[PDB]
């Protein structure tokens, strides 16, 4: 699909509100597998189960291992831009 950029806003105590699968070692992009109700991704709208996360706040995730992506995603704070495409 077309690339979309979605702005999440999260408070300092919460997670992003997604589950992710995939990554370089699995031969597929980082993929959103769940969007958790009431958490930041859900509140933003515009994200979907099945979206690939190509980048977060300008960090390219297209060639990162799963745990590297988890770590980068976990470090984001406040206003967070996701670059996604529905695969």
């Amino acid at each position: 699909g077309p690339i979309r950029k979605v702005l999440l806003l999260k408070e300092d105590h919460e997670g992003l509100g997604i589950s992710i699968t995939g990554g370089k070692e699995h031969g597929v992009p980082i993929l959103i597998s769940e969007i958790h109700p009431g958490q930041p991704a859900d509140r933003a709208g515009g994200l979907h189960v099945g979206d690939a996360i190509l980048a977060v706040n300008g960090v390219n995730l297209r060639d990162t291992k799963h745990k590297e992506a988890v770590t980068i995603l976990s470090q984001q704070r406040g206003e967070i831009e996701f670059e996604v495409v529905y695969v």
Partner: peptide
């Protein structure tokens, strides 16, 4: 399956 909540 590898899956992580973040």
């Amino acid at each position: 399956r590898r899956e992580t909540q973040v």
